[PDB]
């Protein structure tokens, strides 16, 4: 996020980091329950990647994070890689997250819910702060 | 480039798809929602994470960080997967697995 600010630690408890085998953070995701994460299809997650829950500072070793294996990647087969449309994947975890102060689920909308232009929302992540 | 160690956040507005098309044209599909162009931007490494809106006291997943400006310009809208268009598939997938 460019021109954002640091979050209060633990205040976005559904936010996960997707890390590859080398420990590199490459994408975010959101817990929707203890067994499932929603992310983008274009992130290209595999069962060799790891979901990291409960994290704030990726440079700290003192956070009680949960490193969760991925059992199966469910890419929405409406996903169109040419247009990047329908850009959603579900990750089924091999072992459930343990919900806590700092690890819990985001709500999902009904398909008929209205989120009007002009509404102020929030986005979160460990993406670049400067290109 | 700078990658942060610490989790970042930004507030930003939702756009209409019609208005977002003034920036991105026919790249904008119904299963996308644009947000930003407001002095902040999602950027590389944010992909897959949440765009949440607070409704009746609870944060609800409205978007999934998807794509946008290749330089993360804060004057151009970011593009997010529109969760309302995708949630039926989420529920079907959970039910079947």
């Amino acid at each position: 996020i460019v021109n954002g600010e640091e979050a209060v630690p633990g205040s976005w408890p559904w936010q996960v980091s997707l890390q590859d085998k080398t420990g590199f953070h490459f994408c975010g995701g959101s817990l929707i329950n203890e067994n499932w994460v929603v992310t983008a299809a274009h992130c290209g997650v595999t069962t060799s990647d790891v979901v990291v829950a409960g994290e704030f500072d990726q440079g700290s070793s003192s956070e009680k994070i949960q490193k969760l294996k991925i059992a199966k990647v469910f890419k929405n087969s409406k996903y169109n890689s040419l247009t990047i449309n329908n850009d959603i994947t579900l990750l089924k975890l091999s072992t459930a997250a343990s919900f806590s102060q700092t690890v819990s689920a985001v709500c999902l909308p009904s398909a008929s819910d209205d989120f009007a232009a002009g509404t102020t929302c929030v986005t979160t992540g460990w993406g670049l702060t400067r290109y | 480039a700078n990658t942060p160690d610490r989790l970042q956040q930004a507030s930003l507005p939702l756009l209409s798809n019609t208005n977002c098309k003034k920036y991105w044209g026919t790249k904008i599909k119904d299963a996308m929602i644009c947000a930003g162009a407001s002095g902040v931007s999602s950027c590389m490494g944010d992909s897959g994470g949440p765009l949440v809106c607070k409704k009746n006291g609870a944060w609800t997943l409205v978007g999934i960080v998807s794509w946008g400006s290749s330089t993360c310009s804060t004057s151009t809208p970011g593009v997010y997967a529109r969760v309302t268009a995708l949630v039926n598939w989420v529920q079907q997938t959970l039910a079947a697995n």
Binding site: V8, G10, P13, I32, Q101, S104, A105, L108 | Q9, T60
Partner: peptide, 10 residues
Amino acid sequence: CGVPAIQPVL
């Protein structure tokens, strides 16, 4: 869902 135990502050 949706109600963090640690409230965010923007």
